Structure formats: structure tokens, C-alpha cells
Amino acid sequence: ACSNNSIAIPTNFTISVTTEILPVSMTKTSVDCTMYICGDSTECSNLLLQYGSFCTQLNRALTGIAVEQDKNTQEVFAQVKQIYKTPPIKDFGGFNFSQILPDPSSKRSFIEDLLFNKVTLFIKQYGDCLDLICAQKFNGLTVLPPLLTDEMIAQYTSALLAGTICSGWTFGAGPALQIPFPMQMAYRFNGIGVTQNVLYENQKLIANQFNSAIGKIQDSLSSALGKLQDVVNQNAQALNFLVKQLSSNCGAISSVLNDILSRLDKPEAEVQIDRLITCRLQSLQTYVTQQLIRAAEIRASANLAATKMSECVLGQSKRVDFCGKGYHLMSFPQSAPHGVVFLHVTYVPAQEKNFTTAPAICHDGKAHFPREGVFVSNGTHWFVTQRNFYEPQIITTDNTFVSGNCDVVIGIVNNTVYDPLQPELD
Amino acid sequence: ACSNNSIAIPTNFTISVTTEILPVSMTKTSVDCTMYICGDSTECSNLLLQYGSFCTQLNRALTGIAVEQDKNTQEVFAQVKQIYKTPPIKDFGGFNFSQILPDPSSKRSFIEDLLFNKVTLFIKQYGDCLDLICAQKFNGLTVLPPLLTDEMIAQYTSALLAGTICSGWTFGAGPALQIPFPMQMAYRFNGIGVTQNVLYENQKLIANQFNSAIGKIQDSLSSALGKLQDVVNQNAQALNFLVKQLSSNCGAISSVLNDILSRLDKPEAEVQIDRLITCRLQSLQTYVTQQLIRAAEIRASANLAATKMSECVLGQSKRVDFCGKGYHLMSFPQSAPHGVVFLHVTYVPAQEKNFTTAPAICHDGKAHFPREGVFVSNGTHWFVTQRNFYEPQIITTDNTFVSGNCDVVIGIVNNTVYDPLQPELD
Amino acid sequence: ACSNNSIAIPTNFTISVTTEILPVSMTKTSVDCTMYICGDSTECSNLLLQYGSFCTQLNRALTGIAVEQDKNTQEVFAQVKQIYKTPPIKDFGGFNFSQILPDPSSKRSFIEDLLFNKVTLFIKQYGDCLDLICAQKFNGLTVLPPLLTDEMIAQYTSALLAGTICSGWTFGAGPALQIPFPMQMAYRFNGIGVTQNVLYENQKLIANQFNSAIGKIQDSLSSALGKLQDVVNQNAQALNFLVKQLSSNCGAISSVLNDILSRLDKPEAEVQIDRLITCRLQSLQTYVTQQLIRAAEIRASANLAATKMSECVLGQSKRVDFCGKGYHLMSFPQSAPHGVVFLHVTYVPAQEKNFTTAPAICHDGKAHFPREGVFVSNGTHWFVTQRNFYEPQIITTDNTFVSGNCDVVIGIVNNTVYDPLQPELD
Ligand SMILES: *[C@@H]1O[C@H](CO)[C@@H](O[C@@H]2O[C@H](CO)[C@@H](O)[C@H](O)[C@H]2NC(C)=O)[C@H](O)[C@H]1NC(C)=O
Ligand SMILES: *[C@@H]1O[C@H](CO)[C@@H](O[C@@H]2O[C@H](CO)[C@@H](O)[C@H](O)[C@H]2NC(C)=O)[C@H](O)[C@H]1NC(C)=O
Ligand SMILES: *[C@@H]1O[C@H](CO)[C@@H](O[C@@H]2O[C@H](CO)[C@@H](O)[C@H](O)[C@H]2NC(C)=O)[C@H](O)[C@H]1NC(C)=O
Ligand SMILES: *[C@@H]1O[C@H](CO)[C@@H](O[C@@H]2O[C@H](CO)[C@@H](O)[C@H](O)[C@H]2NC(C)=O)[C@H](O)[C@H]1NC(C)=O
Ligand SMILES: *[C@@H]1O[C@H](CO)[C@@H](O[C@@H]2O[C@H](CO)[C@@H](O)[C@H](O)[C@H]2NC(C)=O)[C@H](O)[C@H]1NC(C)=O
Ligand SMILES: *[C@@H]1O[C@H](CO)[C@@H](O[C@@H]2O[C@H](CO)[C@@H](O)[C@H](O)[C@H]2NC(C)=O)[C@H](O)[C@H]1NC(C)=O
Ligand SMILES: *[C@@H]1O[C@H](CO)[C@@H](O[C@@H]2O[C@H](CO)[C@@H](O)[C@H](O)[C@H]2NC(C)=O)[C@H](O)[C@H]1NC(C)=O
Ligand SMILES: *[C@@H]1O[C@H](CO)[C@@H](O[C@@H]2O[C@H](CO)[C@@H](O)[C@H](O)[C@H]2NC(C)=O)[C@H](O)[C@H]1NC(C)=O
Ligand SMILES: *[C@@H]1O[C@H](CO)[C@@H](O[C@@H]2O[C@H](CO)[C@@H](O)[C@H](O)[C@H]2NC(C)=O)[C@H](O)[C@H]1NC(C)=O
Ligand SMILES: *[C@@H]1O[C@H](CO)[C@@H](O)[C@H](O)[C@H]1NC(C)=O
Ligand SMILES: *[C@@H]1O[C@H](CO)[C@@H](O)[C@H](O)[C@H]1NC(C)=O
Ligand SMILES: *[C@@H]1O[C@H](CO)[C@@H](O)[C@H](O)[C@H]1NC(C)=O
Ligand SMILES: *[C@@H]1O[C@H](CO)[C@@H](O)[C@H](O)[C@H]1NC(C)=O
Ligand SMILES: *[C@@H]1O[C@H](CO)[C@@H](O)[C@H](O)[C@H]1NC(C)=O
Ligand SMILES: *[C@@H]1O[C@H](CO)[C@@H](O)[C@H](O)[C@H]1NC(C)=O
Ligand SMILES: *[C@@H]1O[C@H](CO)[C@@H](O)[C@H](O)[C@H]1NC(C)=O
Ligand SMILES: *[C@@H]1O[C@H](CO)[C@@H](O)[C@H](O)[C@H]1NC(C)=O
Ligand SMILES: *[C@@H]1O[C@H](CO)[C@@H](O)[C@H](O)[C@H]1NC(C)=O
């Protein structure tokens, strides 16, 4: 519902913390085309060669993906090359960050430990065999390690957190310039159209709301990571497909191959083998094609995650719903299995009241407009106040400016404007 | 052309409304792999099985697309879960929205009705047969319904429009805070560097320009939707491909299959059938691969559409050419066949004049800089004015600030600065 | 390191120019499916036909890519349809642009000439044969020209540069409004939270830092374009794959085809040919699939490049690290082989000092907060100054506002606030 002469203004607010989860990378894997199709079989390999460079081209396609996975990770996390550490003082004006910062007693935060025990991991079996020996045991299917291990990533997130708390966003665009945390917040409030005194006067309340919100995150995650689990599940499916297809005949007398090389005459075996090669090759092509498309989807997500790091963590965003719902104040990154988790801190208006309003005020024949905020009435008196928080002030010449006259504006009301000068000169 | 001592400033402006069309989704379809390849043929099915899980993997790929289509739609439209309705008063200060709001006498707006009669729709034939019976008649090719029907989508767009008009952007980031429409506009003007008095003084003109612009949209659309039609046409092609390939022999004696099962001996038929299976299977793979790539393109468009909803409709954008050409004021969404249409309202400078300018003014040995706007000369007198609209004001101590001295600045000119105090004390 | 009572403020700054390179398009190519598979062979063509419309569908897929390549180019470059030229005066207040502007004595800039001699170019051989004759010589593989030639692109970049220098960003959102360059910069400084006097007082230094930075770009590029070279290299690989596969037997007696048509009996040749057709067809499908995926990657890059043009060149960005590291002032586009190069001009804080700070000042029982900037102490006196550049000013009633009282704020310090009125009345 709405009207043409009344406005609603929040008289209170709350602080909310929301969680956004993005995938960044996937397990780096590859397939040895020849070993997969022709498992330690000289005759098969000789028959595979006549088909040209199919295996070379497919090996290249998969290699490109494996490399991309490291590129994605470093672009998201390794944005700041200087490593920063937090002080032992732990005095941020009542703001308790003990749940997001690394625990000295792996050096990860409490929240990160929760995340790393929610994602559930062929790959297990490969890890157990541990590399040529494994490659043979798993029919050409191998698993590659990342360049950046979990510990290295944790160090990057730690540096970002230490930076954000100590020097705000300045370290993300130049030298790290230390500032008291309570002050850092004041400017984040200004950035959302709220004056500084609101923070300083309500600092205790704000710190309490913030600390409570963080505790809620723990309960929310404990009782969420489907987006990251789904990536793992899809990859498990793709690998299971390749393994199962090795048991298919596709018109052959046997998927074994060795039962074709033996028993059958040379040329007879060759026909049956060429058949198996064709079927296994197209099975591999199907796998590769889907991996390329899926990889592209992840790349797009990694690019978004990198963007959010720059705009949500290393600065303050003015883009609606980009860094969480409500008005963006700040963000804190956390590491996660093959991904990144953002904790977005936002300002949300709470309890509003209805006031009578007017576009402009007529004083001495001239129309006065507010420099900022709106004109409102409590039923007997008119006040000027900021839009995002009810804080009524006397309407004075230092709160308004003059333009045109009282005969032009439609929604013009008669009132007085206080002049903070003459009354103390007379 | 340009110079080093002169500036051009707009003395008038116009309001423009532009239309941007994005695809969000495509018809949800799927293919029953076995039915397509082996149409009610026991012998064929038995020969298909030996090829492994190809059909399972392909069915999964297509299913994933069909699901994604609903995900895309709800992300774009279902951003606000609270449904809002407009009042019967229809008083928005002279702004006529009767062409964008739903018509009580399907509950769609006039403009939406135009859009829904411009897109032209295998699919027609399927709709006519209406589900197993149809699946058999169409050789395994089926069509699935959306979770959100056109009526439900219209309700979401209606809620967004009611919200935008009544509470501006506040409902997109918290509680809906009612405000007079004319005032809402004032703040949208501030957001583009234009003062409030410009709107209130020219409210009648602005409303007329706006209303005229909307009427032009009707003529533009009536006399546009190629982006949405192209998506339909591409999908029609892909389905036609699958159907036509069922008439190909690919070396077989016949594409009929039944003419192979009969006449030929058991093993003879089996060879001819295995051939048909291979050709039909690779034809299906070709279709699926292209559908996956095309689907990715749509997803990317849906993500952009969702972003625009949040940044153009539920707020005011500061990104150049993101929400139309010119300075962004506001946007209004409209529904469309498998897509979304945005009407972008922008401010455009009209008629500029040339003025002589100067970086700073020297008064009593000190250099005065403008707090905002520029210093300009009309040939005899110097004035200070805002950049996006010519509105010359007297240069006073309340319009400028002092820094350094007259011997530092290169483009320094001699003039007087009026002090709005002493003249009324003496 | 950080503390709860001290702040660091830059006392100097530098100007940096960084280079960002994006791909926009790739060489437009296509393959004549029939000619590739059946090179001037009637018998082969007749055997190809029985396989249905595979070639038609593949030809369409490749055609779609070739068309997209022109769409990508025009979206990035042809954003402004009006062509602008620079004056012969070349007076921009000490800013030397002679290295980015076109050289009258191809009409390209010095920097562009460097870029166009760094990218290294099957395609060479095709250019040498120069169209049916070539298509036959190269087995159905052809090369298509762009709609926009290098000269036309250079004209678009020239217009953008002339526009940016003469009318700033206004031409990107309406009529081109001339402004002195030195003034244009002043507003770009305001956009990053720095006052105007900083530019005008240090204009000479700033121009020198800028001019030096540009010279560094020449040395950087001369001593970089791997992103663009990689695109070329990948395409060369894809084409080499197709050519090499024409020498594969895939079980055939010969890849020659003519040695199959001859020697062998009609039905014997037909079997061997059907085999070759199947292998060549799947080789072509592999090529096409990878081209579609790669093309999508380029499209995404072109979309980003187009976005940067609008937000970095035709305006000033507030997005962190979107238009280079540091605080964005402006950008200048340069053309490049199948891509675009952006020179990003950014402001970077240099040498900071430590000061003692305080949230608010207590005067006569009331708490005074800064209208802008921070309160700092040099050890004996308190001052108020802007955050991004140390410039200490006397704390006065015109620099602060009053809210609440001295008993509410925690970090409250006792000091005096100067009233710029009474002292000259008494
Ligand atoms: C910051 O928050 C943590 C977590 O709630 C607080 O740690 C708890 O402190 C209580 C009181 O001593 C103990 O009983 C709990 O066992 C502690 N929990 C954990 C996980 O250690 C910490 O005291 C808070 N610090 C401040 C300054 O508020
Ligand atoms: C603004 O809302 C907050 C709640 O977020 C109010 O603070 C609560 O006040 C009640 C008493 O009415 C206490 O029991 C709660 O413990 C307080 N919560 C917190 C986090 O301190 C606050 O009083 C409200 N202020 C106004 C002006 O309404
Ligand atoms: C509107 O606000 C004014 C100012 O606060 C209210 O007037 C004051 O009311 C208090 C009692 O709560 C008196 O002690 C003050 O002396 C009054 N000041 C003046 C100038 O009259 C006024 O009552 C409020 N109106 C409504 C409807 O709440
Ligand atoms: C808002 O715009 C609509 C559409 O132009 C106006 O409706 C027309 O009003 C005239 C005058 O009565 C009729 O002759 C037309 O037939 C109406 N057109 C339609 C489609 O209904 C409407 O009157 C305008 N309302 C206001 C307040 O301006
Ligand atoms: C600004 O431009 C508008 C046009 O958009 C002018 O308004 C028109 O004025 C003519 C008379 O010269 C009328 O016949 C038209 O009907 C008016 N159009 C509208 C929509 O009202 C306006 O006068 C110009 N103002 C200035 C100062 O130049
Ligand atoms: C520049 O603007 C000034 C102020 O409007 C013009 O001076 C006024 O001109 C009007 C006639 O149109 C006189 O009635 C006023 O008394 C003049 N005021 C003053 C202070 O002289 C001035 O003529 C304009 N200059 C040009 C070239 O247009
Ligand atoms: C702008 O920069 C160019 C490039 O450095 C300057 O051109 C050089 O000028 C010197 C001095 O006359 C010559 O010795 C060099 O050979 C010139 N280099 C080139 C490439 O032409 C130009 O003089 C500068 N102009 C201004 C106003 O600073
Ligand atoms: C700010 O930094 C600049 C360097 O970017 C200083 O300018 C240099 O000053 C030295 C003398 O100390 C000269 O030899 C250099 O040639 C100057 N460089 C340039 C480009 O002019 C500047 O003096 C510093 N200003 C302050 C206040 O520290
Ligand atoms: C803090 O700044 C003040 C103001 O500049 C310094 O006081 C001045 O010092 C100069 C000598 O450099 C004297 O000539 C002025 O007369 C002093 N002014 C006043 C009001 O005392 C002060 O010394 C600086 N403090 C520190 C630690 O540098
Ligand atoms: C404001 O007025 C609207 C419309 O009557 C009403 O629905 C809403 O509850 C009112 N809010 C308050 C705080 O009175
Ligand atoms: C507000 O709307 C009412 C009709 O409900 C009308 O009578 C009144 O004049 C309008 N007020 C203004 C300032 O337009
Ligand atoms: C405002 O006061 C003037 C007299 O100075 C009077 O003529 C006018 O009608 C009044 N307007 C209103 C809304 O009371
Ligand atoms: C402003 O000056 C330029 C350059 O001479 C000229 O092209 C333009 O038409 C002039 N505009 C006006 C309104 O005089
Ligand atoms: C403007 O350019 C002219 C040359 O055309 C020059 O003589 C004049 O001094 C310049 N003015 C300023 C303020 O630089
Ligand atoms: C400005 O006035 C001063 C005298 O106060 C004079 O010395 C100076 O040359 C004048 N500057 C100009 C541009 O007229
Ligand atoms: C500021 O203080 C920090 C912490 O002691 C120190 O590391 C830094 O070097 C100091 N900077 C200056 C300019 O004194
Ligand atoms: C700053 O921190 C110190 C502890 O290191 C503390 O004693 C002091 O009171 C704090 N100052 C303020 C304003 O909080
Ligand atoms: C500020 O001055 C008041 C007296 O007006 C005194 O009571 C208070 O303690 C002083 N505060 C500080 C920090 O010196």
C-alpha cells in the first residue's frame, strides 16, 4: 500500500550476516588415451595408431582443463602477495572475530573446520594406491595434485582477513594504511547513506548484533554445501562412466580383449579389436566433451568469485544484491573444499513509522529544499531527517537551499526556517 | 572540436525510454534414447544394450538442461516473494502507467499483450496430441511444461511494478517503505548529479515527456523480438534434425527397421540393425552436444537478466550503458515469451551552449574553488553552476572553498566573491 | 600491523599506467564438409549422401561461429557512430598524448605499431594462393575476411580517443560537451575522494608523472601479448589436426581414396570408402565441437571487453580492480591484432605517515564529528583532513557537525572548535 502525502522511515536497524558459497575448481584429473583403450596390448596399440592423432588431441583437451584448474584457484585467492598477520591484542572495539580467524592450536578457523567436514570425497581408491603403477591399475585414469595446497590457501585467506581488519580496503589498492576498526565501520556506514554518529552512539548494540549473527552462522552450517558437493558428485559420475564402459562388448565377443587376442586367428582378432577400439574411443570422446563443458561452467564461477573478492572483500559494493541482501558494509572470506565461502555483512532497516511529508517548504516567498534527507511532520511540527534512519532535526538555513519560489512547486507547505545567527546577535 | 578555455553546458533535457530484450529460458524438451533408436523393437533393444550406458549418460545430459530451464526462470523473476498490488487511485503526480500495469479486463498489461503476439511458435503437433501415447507417436521426443506458468510470472512482474512505484527500491533491500512517486523521482535525479528543484519546477514537462515516450514504445513494438524468435528457430532446427535422421540408411538396406527384421535372416538383420543403431546414436549425440552448448549460452543470458533485475529495477545503476543509454533513472520489467523485457528510463542532455570557463577565482590573494559545479562567464559576469544543467548562480563564500593562493593556479582569473553576511550587518 | 588509536595517511602520490589485453575475435574460417570428406569424388559423394544431413548441420555450426566473430568485433569497437578528430593545437595542459594518437605519416599510433608487430600469424598459405581454386587446393578449408578491416577499427579507436580527450565521458551518454583537459582531470580526482586543489597545485608534477608512465609502456611492450598469441596458436593446432587426419587409413587400405576407387571392385571400394567417410566425418565432428567451445570462450571475453569500453573508457569506474589496480581515473583504448588493449590510468597513494586519531571531539559538552575526513594529531595540535591525501586544516564549525553529547562516544577527546564569525565581530 502507498499514498501521495506520506512517507515511511525506519527508526531502528539490525545487522545481518549471510553466507554465499561458490565453487572455484574441481579435482585435477586426466586420462592416458592409449592406456585406456589398449591396456598393455601391443596388437591393440598397433591398431590404434592407424586412426591418426585422435588420442593426442583428446589428451591435449584434458590437459588444458587440468591446467585451468590452478589458474582458477590462484586468480581467486592469490590476489594479495603480501602476507599479513593479526596482533595478539584482539581489541576491535567489541567486535569478536575469534570464529573467523585461524586457530593457533591445521591453522584454520572454527568455521573453516566446519566446512571441511561437510563435503564428502574412484578418487579415494587412487589415493590409497599411492605413479605409473597406479595409472596401470586404474586403466589410464590418473589424479593430479594442485599447485596450491589447502595450507597455502589458508595463508592467503588469513592475509586477506588480517588486511581487512587492520587497514580496511586500502591494502587492496596500494599500501596498507592502519585504522582503528570502529572508525573503519563509520565510513562503511557513510557508504550506505547513514551518518557517523549512528555507529558511535550505538557501537555497543552493533557489536552485540554482529557477534550474535556470527554465532548463528555456526548453527546454520552445523544443521548447506550442496553446491560444492554437486560438483564432486558430477565428476564421480563421469569417471564411473568411463570405468563401466570398459566392460561393454559393443558387438564384440568379449570386452576382455585378451580373449580376442587368444583363441581367434590374427585377422579375426583384429576385426574384433578394431570394433572395441571404436567403441572405447567414442566413449572417451563423450567423457571429454562433457568435461570441457562442465569445466567452462566452473571457470565462469571462478571468475565471479574473483570479482566478488575484489568488490566485496577488498572494497564496498554499491551493486544491489551483489554482496548479499540489504546494504553492503563488508565481507570476510573463508576457505572451503575446492571453493570459497563469503560471509557478507549487511545493514537492514527494521521498524518503520508513517510520517506526513512535503516536497518543499515556503518561508518568506521562497521555496526551501533539503540539502539531504526529507521533510516530515509528527502531526504538529516539521523536521528534516536522513532517509535511512529516523533522526528529526530542526529545519534551518544550514539544512536547506533556496530555488525558485512558492508559486511553482505543487507540494509546497507553509512553515518557518530557523536562522542560526540573528537570534544571538540581537 | 574542443578548446582549452571554453565549456559546453546543457540548458535543457529530454526523457527517453528504451527497450532491452533478453532470453531467459527455452522450451523444456527431452528424448527417450531407447525409444528413439529402437522404436518398439525387442531385437533392437537387445542389440542396443551391448553398447553399455550411452543412453543413460545422454538422458542425464538432457534432463540436466530441462531442470536448468526452471532454475533460470525463477532466478530472474522470483526475486521478491511478497506479492504487492497497486491502489485504484492511480495518482502518481501526472505519470501515466496504465500501459505497463495489468489490465483487470489473462491479467496482463497492454504492452505485454503486444509482445506475446509477436513470437511465433514439432511443438505445435505435440500440443495437439495431448503422455506415453504422444511419446510413441513422436519417436521418443517429448515436451515438458514449466514449473512457473505465464500467469505466475505475470504475478511476479506485477508485484515488482507495484513495489517500484509505491516504495521505490527499498522493498528490494528490506521492508517496503512507501513514498510519493514525485519524491521518488527527485532522489533518482540526485543520483545522476542533478539537483531536486529541476524536477519539481519542471514536473509537468517531465511527466508529459515520459507519457509520450511510453506511447512511442507501443508504436515501436507494433511496427523487434528477433532475439527471442531466434532461440525458438534454433530449437526447431535441432528437433527437425533428429526427425529427419530417422529416414537415413547410413549404409543400411532400409531406415524402416521392420524391413530388416523381416526378410533377412536373424544374423543378417542383426548386422544391418547394429549399423542403424550406430548411426542413430551418433546423430543423437550430435544433437545433445549442440543443445548443451546452446543451453550454456541461455544460462549466461539468464544470469545477466537476473543481474539487471537487481541493479536496474530494484535500484539505480551507476554503470555506463548497463541500464540503457544516457543517465539511468529507473526501469520497469515486462513479461515475454520465454524471456524478459526491460523498459529503461534515462535522462539525456539536450541543447548545450558555449561558455568561457576558468579553474579557479582569485579574490583577495586567495584562490577560491567551487564546492560543486563549474565557473562560467556569459561575457560580462562570472557564475557558478551544476555541470549537467545550466543554472547560473552568484559566486559566494557558501559556494566555494579556499586552498593555496593566486600565484599557484595556472588558469586563475580575477573576480569578486560575495559574502552573504556583512552587507546586512552594516 | 595495526592499533586502535592511530591512523596512517599518505602525504604524496604517484600516477601509474597499466596495460590490460583482451581477445575479441578469431580468424573467420569454415569447412566445406563434402569437399573435405569427398575430394572431387563422385562415388564418395554418393556414399556420403546416405548418411543424411550431418554435413548440413556441421556447416551451420561453423557458419554461426564465423558470423559471431563480426558481431563480437562491432560490439566492442563500434559503440560510437560519430567520428571525431583531434585538433592540431595539441595543448592539453602539459599532457603528452602523441604516443597514443594516430600518426599522420597506415594511420596508427606509435604504440599500436608496436603491438601489431608482436603477434605472429595454414593461413599464410591460403593468403598466398589468393576463391574456389583455393578451396580445392586446401581440401575444403577456407578463410573468410572480416567486415571491419584494421583501418576501420583504427578509425573507431581514433574517434573514442578524440572524444575522451575533448569531451570526457559526456559523448558516451549524449552530445559531446567540450571541456579543458586539466578541468576534466579535476573531476576525475573528485571521483576518487580527492579534492580539486590537489590537481591544480600539482598539475606540473602530475603531467610529468603521466608522460613518464607512457614512455615506460613502450619499453614494457618492446621488451606481453601471449594472451592474443595463444588464441592464434590454438586455432593453428585445430586446423593442423584436420589436415593430418586426411592421411589416416582408420583400417582402410589407403587414405588416398583414388587407390580404392581403382584396383578394387565396385562393392569392395564402397566398403573401404564408407570406412574412410566414417573416420573423416568423426574427425570433422571433433574439430567442430572444440571450435564451438573455444568460440564461446572468446565471446565471453568480447562481452567483457565491451563492458570495459563502456565503463572504463566512456566513464569512470568505482569497481575495485575492474579498470586496473589503484583508484581509477581514466582509460585509453588501442587497437590490436584480433583484440583490444586498454591503458588504465590510476591514482596510487605513495608515502604515508602515522598520526594519532580520535572518533570525535568534545567542545562545550557536545560531540563534534567531521563532515568529511578524519581527526588527527601531530603530537600537539588536532587537525581535520581528507583521507586520501594529508592536508591538515583547522577544526572549525564549518568542518564538523554536532550529534549527541560527550558522555556517549567512547573515543572522545577534549579540544576546541574554531568559530569563524565572532572573532571578527568583537
Ligand atoms: C569471543 O567469542 C568466543 C566464542 O564464543 C568466546 O569464547 C568462549 O568464552 C566462554 C567464556 O569464557 C567459554 O566458556 C567458551 O568455552 C569459549 N568458547 C570457545 C569456542 O572458546 C570468547 O570468550 C569471546 N571473546 C570476547 C572478548 O568476547
Ligand atoms: C532496536 O532493536 C534492538 C534489537 O535488535 C533493541 O535491543 C534489544 O532491546 C531489548 C529490550 O527491549 C533487549 O532485551 C535486547 O537484549 C536488546 N538486544 C540487543 C542485541 O541488545 C533496541 O533496544 C532497539 N532500539 C530501539 C530504539 O527500538
Ligand atoms: C512533535 O515534536 C515536538 C518537538 O519534540 C513536540 O513538542 C514538544 O513536546 C514535549 C513533550 O513531549 C514538550 O516538553 C516540548 O516543550 C514540546 N516542544 C515544543 C516546541 O512544543 C510535539 O509534541 C510533537 N508532536 C507530536 C504529535 O508528537
Ligand atoms: C493514461 O493513458 C491512457 C492511454 O493513452 C488513456 O486512455 C485513453 O483515454 C482517452 C480519453 O478518454 C480515450 O479516448 C482512449 O480510448 C483511452 N485509451 C485506452 C487504451 O484506454 C488514459 O485516459 C490516461 N489517463 C490519464 C490520467 O492520463
Ligand atoms: C525544453 O524542451 C522541451 C521539449 O522537450 C520544450 O517543451 C516544448 O515547447 C514547445 C514550444 O517551444 C511546445 O510546443 C511543446 O509542446 C513543448 N513540449 C512539451 C513536451 O511540453 C521546452 O519548452 C524546452 N525548454 C527550454 C528552456 O528550452
Ligand atoms: C550576464 O548576466 C548578467 C546578470 O543577469 C546580465 O546583467 C543584467 O542584465 C539585465 C538585462 O537583461 C539587467 O536588467 C540587469 O540589471 C543586469 N545586472 C547586472 C548586475 O548588470 C549581463 O547582461 C549578462 N551578460 C551577457 C553578455 O549576457
Ligand atoms: C611529446 O612526446 C614526444 C615523444 O617523446 C616528443 O617527441 C620527441 O621530441 C624530441 C625533442 O625534440 C626529439 O628529439 C625526439 O626525436 C621526438 N621523438 C619522437 C618519437 O618524435 C615530443 O616533443 C613531446 N611533445 C611535447 C610538447 O612534450
Ligand atoms: C612526491 O613524489 C614525487 C616523485 O614522484 C617527488 O618529485 C620528485 O622530487 C625529486 C627531488 O626530491 C626530483 O629529483 C624528481 O625529479 C621529482 N620527480 C618528478 C616527476 O618531478 C615530489 O617532490 C614528492 N613530493 C613530496 C611532498 O614529497
Ligand atoms: C603541529 O602543527 C602546529 C601548527 O603548524 C605546529 O605549531 C607551529 O609551529 C611553527 C614552527 O614550525 C610555529 O612557527 C607556529 O607559530 C606554531 N603554531 C602554533 C599555533 O603553535 C606544531 O609545532 C606542530 N607539532 C608538532 C609536534 O609538529
Ligand atoms: C503505514 O500506513 C500503511 C497504509 O495504511 C499501513 O499499512 C502500515 O501498517 C502503516 N505503518 C505504520 C507503522 O503505521
Ligand atoms: C494526494 O491525493 C489526494 C487524493 O487521494 C488529493 O486529493 C491530494 O490533493 C493529493 N495531494 C497532493 C499534494 O497531490
Ligand atoms: C502561505 O502564506 C501565504 C502568505 O504569506 C499565503 O498567501 C498562502 O496561501 C499560504 N499557503 C498555505 C498553504 O497556507
Ligand atoms: C561551440 O563551439 C564549437 C567550436 O567552435 C562549435 O562547433 C559549436 O557549434 C558551438 N556550440 C554553440 C551552441 O555555440
Ligand atoms: C589556451 O590556448 C591558447 C592557444 O590556443 C593559449 O594561448 C592560452 O594561453 C591557453 N590558455 C590557458 C589558460 O592555458
Ligand atoms: C589580479 O589582481 C592583482 C592585484 O590584486 C594583480 O596584481 C593581478 O595581476 C590581477 N590578475 C589578473 C589576471 O588580472
Ligand atoms: C607506523 O606504525 C607501524 C607500527 O609500529 C610501523 O610498522 C610503520 O613503519 C610506521 N610508519 C611510519 C611512517 O612511521
Ligand atoms: C586502545 O587499546 C589499548 C590497549 O592496547 C587500551 O588500553 C586503550 O584504552 C584503547 N583505546 C581506546 C580508545 O579504546
Ligand atoms: C573534558 O572537559 C570536561 C570539563 O568540561 C572534563 O570533565 C572531562 O573529564 C574532560 N575530558 C577529558 C578527556 O579530558
Residue numbers in the entry:
A (entry chain C), B (entry chain B), C (entry chain A): 706 to 810, 813 to 828, 833 to 841, 848 to 940, 944 to 1146
Which of the paper's sentences describe this entry?
Coronavirus S glycoproteins fold as spring-loaded trimers transitioning from the prefusion to the postfusion state, upon receptor engagement and proteolytic activation to promote membrane fusion and viral entry. This metastability, however, constitutes a challenge for producing the S2 subunit (fusion machinery) in the prefusion state in the absence of the S1 subunit. Furthermore, we previously designed a fusion machinery (S2 subunit) antigen stabilized through the introduction of 4 out of 6 HexaPro mutations (A892P, A899P, A942P and V987P), the VFLIP inter-protomer disulfide (Y707C-T883C), an intra-protomer disulfide (F970C-G999C) and a C-terminus foldon trimerization domain.
To design a prefusion S2 subunit trimer with a native quaternary structure, we selected mutations from a deep-mutational scanning dataset of cell-surface expressed S using a library spanning residues 883 to 103442. We first evaluated the effect of three individual mutations introduced in the C-44 background, namely T961F, D994E, and Q1005R, which were among the highest ranking based on their expression/fusion score ratio. Single-particle electron microscopy (EM) characterization of each negatively stained glycoprotein revealed that the design harboring the T961F mutation (E-31) formed prefusion closed S2 trimers whereas the other two constructs, harboring either D994E (E-32) or Q1005R (E-33), adopted several conformations, including one with a splayed-open apex similar to C-4417. To unveil the E-31 architecture and understand the effect of the T961F mutation, we determined a cryoEM structure of this antigen at 2.7 Å resolution. Our structure shows that E-31 folds with virtually identical tertiary and quaternary structures to the S2 subunit from the prefusion S ectodomain trimer (PDB 6VXX41) with which the protomers can be superimposed with r.m.s.d values of 0.7 Å. The engineered T961F substitution, which maps to the distal half of the fusion machinery apex, reinforces interactions between HR1 and the central helix of one protomer and the upstream helix of a neighboring protomer (cavity filling), likely explaining the compact, closed trimer conformation observed.
